[PDB]
Symmetry: C2
Subunit: 183 residues, 2 copies
């Protein structure tokens, strides 16, 4: 049931748009980025570039790098574990909430955010899209695509140069110095 695409020599996402398809649990296109596994079930080529659908799952760990997107809206829908989401609104106040499976978090464009996984193997459902396309392939770009199944045994830490060549390709703006005012 395997295809070959511009993204993977082995994929369960067909290369031709307008094709119905199913993908079993965990078999979307995969990518590592630090301790986490990102799995892509649908990309821009599936939806005339209107949206995507992916999951992000990883071990108990520290708050990911603060960042924003300018033309992209994000969804955080927890399916496993517990994840803490940090958002900063346009005015400037910062809110956090431990999101348990079934809970939902929305981060609008130009809003600074970050998430922390507070249970082992937590999992988040994600959508990331907007006016100027979908940004699913960001993860395998900054990080690495992976043929392995499961969590990375060891974090994939990108060499620092990736943090420049990529942000000007994937609508993402890191804020290496950021604060979080709530604990």
């Amino acid at each position: 049931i395997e295809y070959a695409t511009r993204h993977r020599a082995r994929s369960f996402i067909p290369p031709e748009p307008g094709k119905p398809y199913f993908i079993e649990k965990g078999l979307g296109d995969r990518a590592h980025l630090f301790g986490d596994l990102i799995t892509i079930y649908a990309g821009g080529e599936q939806t005339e570039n209107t949206f995507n659908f992916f999951t992000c799952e990883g071990p108990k760990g520290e708050v990911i790098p603060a960042h924003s997107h300018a033309d992209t809206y994000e969804v955080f829908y927890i399916t496993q574990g517990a994840v803490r989401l940090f958002v900063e609104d346009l005015e400037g106040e910062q809110h956090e909430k431990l999101l348990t499976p079934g809970d939902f978090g929305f981060v609008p464009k130009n809003c600074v955010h970050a998430y922390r996984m507070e249970r082992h193997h937590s999992q988040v459902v994600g959508v990331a899209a907007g006016p100027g396309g979908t940004f699913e392939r960001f993860f395998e770009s900054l990080g690495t695509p992976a043929e392995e199944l499961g969590l990375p045994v060891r974090p994939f830490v990108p060499e620092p140069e990736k943090f420049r060549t990529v942000p000007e390709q994937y609508d993402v703006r890191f804020r290496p110095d950021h604060q979080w005012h709530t604990g």
Copy 2:
């Protein structure tokens, strides 16, 4: 905190875009259609009409009426129970798969589809959008908005005049003529 919006007197989706928000499990805008509960956590007003985010849960039931979307792509991502997805491709080849939690189904536009829920209280995470915009307010339109939590105690059966008016507003082609071979 509850807001008033153009869709609900009481809602956890803010009325104004650019505002980040959290919603607790089950507390999105709710709708009933047949025996199914649809819960909206994000609509077009949140993402500049690019995408939405909703869940669909219901009792073990019959196959929903077969239908198609001219300009809308559908995600089926199963979170509870098990859901059998029926799709017909553009070339007339029908396809059937039982989707268990973590499995993913994709229905591209113009593809005739229908789902059957095969465990009590199965749950599907959906996204329905395309070039034309987002689809979410369809369910409360064909069916009804709902203030209660939990599954409809008894199914909401829309008037046949709703079956005529709604497609003129939402992007749904009902197919009472369609036969599913696969089985």
